[PDB]
Design a binder for these strands. Structure first.
Lengths: 20, 329, 180, 141
RNA sequence: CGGGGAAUCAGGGUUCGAUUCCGGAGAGGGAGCCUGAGAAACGGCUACCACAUCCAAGGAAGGCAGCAGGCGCGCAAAUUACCCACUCCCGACCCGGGGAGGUAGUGACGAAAAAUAACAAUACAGGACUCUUUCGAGGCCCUGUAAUUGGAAUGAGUCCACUUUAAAUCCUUUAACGAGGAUCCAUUGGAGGGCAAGUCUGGUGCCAAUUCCAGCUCCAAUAGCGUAUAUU
């Protein structure tokens, strides 16, 4: 499916990097 | 009616099979392989092994012309047409041509409204030869195109119906046959045609059922030389049913015993990468022991290739019927 | 000749070294922590902080009773206090060199909407502000980067024409209520 | 030892003028005869007519046969040879076509792989090679 | 063309300034004038030089480095639009005129703001805290991920009206319609030697290595990102 863009992609990146 | 649809679905399935198997053709169980594939040879190297351009020329090459040097001839005629000034009617005057013999119907054509356009040929243009012209497929049409089917060619102010041969456009001296015009890359159509000195545009059309011409190809006339050759490549495959240390027993290649002997000096290759050499038949059923550089997997399949030099067909029809106006289906 | 102005600025500076793991992780930390959109907003706040620190340092090179130092240092300290970054008790130039990017990032309207309880997250705060749901003292604000002053802190209310505020329901609720 | 008087300004700047002239970049940029010998004529791009297609052999430890086009520049008539990204993109270029040609990339220096080719083809028939490769546009003839 | 100035900036420097402000110069190249307070004036005249327009062949007429517009040149740059409403200027003048100027059009030169989703339940995965030596229990929480559901909120658009304005457009303001694959679908480059990012796949040839081509996965910046050239 489609990739999120803008603030949402950076939020997903931050969750993938620092949360776990 | 429905037999055309059956043929179209058959051609679709044939294009699918020739896409997913590159050149695989089943061995006939009734006809001897040394007879059905009699005019075939095996090559250790497809790229570097030589091949005589003048070996086994057919009757049709007795009907065409050849160039001792095409590049020098083209430079000579272009220098003559650019520098020299022939004593004739030159540009600007409204002239009237007395041309000797024409069919009458051409005159009637001008009475409906069809434009009548003439042009003076260069020297050596009217002579027939072999034209190799590189083409690429337009995305609007994806119907299958068999290699030896008739197509309408627009090449350099000249329209004619003819049957080409499709081969790959590579950097080698010989090019493998493509029996279907693949709709991703640029291939080469080889045809018997009047000599046209490049550059010129190459439009290919398919005669549809309703009279419309469907656009298939587009491109430039690459060269006019009969020394280009098409190479048909045929795969025979079989099952290595007994695998030992660098020595295998393979079935499903042949069905006679001397068919192995006639095709003995042809080296073998497999789908997983190793090569092999034919040692000796078992007997009477085509089972045969091969010498391999490495071990074979049970799921591996042993293959060999047969090569035959292929030349186009004499299908040059200079009459192109007038289409109906085109419409989107 | 035209009656037009040609004066403009860039509000950020691209980093001199594009790829280093420390700065990339720090910027990703800030973007995730404050719900920012791109590295450009982080760089914009970095550029403002760098300009303030450079002005403070050049003032600090001056003599203690320079009239320019007194006047402009008082002005800079008063502005930094006014936007809520410095305390009223830290009004000294040296303390300006102790400021971080995180203070200026807290004083934004997105962070103040999240911290005041108007939004359930920082991304909810950004969406709420951008959708004309947030007002400051009477004034509907559409800018998430609106730097809130201390005197505007107690007047962030929630836009009297907004559905969750004054009460006219939106497109979705009105459309669903007409089905049945 | 360098002079350090309080009245040595003229000597210092005259020496600096001359020793500036002893630098290759300064002399190329200030002598005029590099832009009077650059085929681009100081420009970043130039248009040309495709004279023909030639083949340049690559370096000795890694043998390859790259394909270039010999083109003649419009504004000054000079002949240069230009690189094409792959063998497929060579099929979009014909003799006697208009081509827009740029440098190969490192401010004027030759290729570290293909010896002595300086330029790469950017546009042909007023459309880009990148669009033609990706099927974004077609070219006229 | 010079200057005010622009870029970079530890400090010194370096590079740029054709270009709206100031001063100068020219009106195809030279030259000589008339009038006038002021001109060696070219949207004044007179010649020569170079081009070039109409012609009944006697003659007559020419100057876009003004605004548009065309050709040519090239890597390289916009409408043959509307108006004296604003700013000012000129005249005999409170009233006339002004391609000065203003307003639209073209415009990813460049600069600023800023969408492409948010939340709740449910299901798994982690992290705390209480009770247990632990296993374990937490209608104890917190945080993530969804081929899972759920209505709530909104702009992009379509389009009444007002406002805008010389007349309009745009913005702002407001009716009505307008979101689940919210298909209302974000690009551009790079990575399996070094700065951010690979023990991957499939075709195609040479004697397992090895040319060419298509991909997947990952990384960076993001309504922007490559490239070339110059320069710092």
């Amino acid at each position: 499916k489609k990739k999120k863009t803008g603030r949402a992609k950076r939020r997903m990146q931050y969750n993938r990097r620092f949360v776990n | 009616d429905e037999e055309a649809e059956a043929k179209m679905l058959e051609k679709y399935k044939q294009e699918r099979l020739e896409e997913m198997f590159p050149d695989e053709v089943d061995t006939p169980r009734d006809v001897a392989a040394r007879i059905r594939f009699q005019k075939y040879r095996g090559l250790k190297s497809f790229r570097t092994s030589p091949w005589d351009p003048k070996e086994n020329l057919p009757q049709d090459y007795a009907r065409i012309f050849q160039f001792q040097n095409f590049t020098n001839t083209r430079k000579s005629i272009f220098k003559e047409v650019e520098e020299k000034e022939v004593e004739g009617a030159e540009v600007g005057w409204y002239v009237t041509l007395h041309v000797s013999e024409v069919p009458v119907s051409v005159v009637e054509c001008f009475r409906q409204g069809t434009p009548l356009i003439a042009f003076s040929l260069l020297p050596h243009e009217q002579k027939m030869s072999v034209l190799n012209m590189v083409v690429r497929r337009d995305p609007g049409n994806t119907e299958p195109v068999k290699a030896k089917e008739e197509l309408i060619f627009h090449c350099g102010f000249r329209r004619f119906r003819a049957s080409p041969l499709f081969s790959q456009h590579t950097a080698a001296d010989k090019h493998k046959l493509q029996r279907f015009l693949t709709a991703d890359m640029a291939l080469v159509a080889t045809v018997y045609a009047p000599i046209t000195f490049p550059p010129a545009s190459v439009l290919l059309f398919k005669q549809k059922s309703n009279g419309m011409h469907s656009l298939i190809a587009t491109g430039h006339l690459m060269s006019v030389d009969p020394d280009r050759m098409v190479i048909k490549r045929v795969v025979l495959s079989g099952h290595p049913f007994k695998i030992f240390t660098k020595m295998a027993v393979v079935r499903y290649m042949f069905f006679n015993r001397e068919d192995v002997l006639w095709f003995k000096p042809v080296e073998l290759r497999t789908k997983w990468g190793r090569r092999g050499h034919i040692k000796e038949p078992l007997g009477t059923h085509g089972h045969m022991k091969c010498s391999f550089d490495g071990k074979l997997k049970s799921q591996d399949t042993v293959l060999m290739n047969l090569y035959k030099r292929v030349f186009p067909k004499w299908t040059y029809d200079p009459y192109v019927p007038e289409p109906v106006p085109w419409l989107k289906s | 000749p035209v009656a037009r102005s040609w004066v403009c600025r860039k509000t950020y500076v691209t980093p001199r070294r594009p790829f280093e793991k420390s700065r990339l992780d720090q910027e990703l930390k800030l973007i995730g922590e404050y719900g920012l959109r791109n590295k450009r907003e982080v760089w914009r706040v970095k550029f403002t902080l760098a300009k303030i620190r450079k002005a403070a340092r050049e003032l600090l090179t001056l003599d203690e009773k320079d009239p320019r130092r007194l006047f402009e240092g008082n002005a800079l300290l008063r502005r930094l206090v006014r936007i809520g970054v410095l305390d009223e008790g830290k009004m000294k130039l040296d303390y300006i060199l102790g400021l971080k990017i995180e203070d200026f990032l807290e004083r934004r309207l997105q962070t103040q909407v999240f911290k005041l309880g108007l939004a359930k997250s920082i991304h909810h705060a950004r969406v709420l502000i951008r959708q004309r749901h947030i007002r400051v003292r009477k004034q509907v604000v559409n800018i998430p980067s609106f730097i809130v002053r201390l005197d505007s802190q107690k007047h962030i209310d929630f836009s009297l024409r907004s559905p969750y505020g004054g009460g006219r329901p939106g497109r979705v609720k009105r459309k669903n209520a007409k089905k049945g | 030892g360098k002079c350090r008087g309080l009245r040595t300004a003229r000597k210092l700047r005259s020496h600096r003028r001359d020793q500036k002239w002893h630098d290759k970049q300064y002399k190329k940029a200030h002598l005029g005869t590099a832009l009077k010998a650059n085929p681009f004529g100081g420009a970043s791009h130039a248009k040309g007519i495709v004279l023909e297609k030639v083949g340049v052999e690559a370096k000795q430890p890694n043998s390859a046969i790259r394909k270039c086009v010999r083109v003649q520049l419009i504004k000054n008539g000079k002949k240069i040879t230009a690189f094409v990204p792959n063998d497929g993109c060579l099929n979009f270029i014909e003799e006697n076509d208009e081509v827009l040609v740029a440098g190969f990339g490192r401010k004027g220096h030759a290729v570290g792989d293909i010896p002595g080719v300086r330029f790469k083809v950017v546009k042909v028939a007023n459309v880009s090679l990148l669009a033609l490769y990706k099927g974004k546009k077609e070219r006229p003839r």
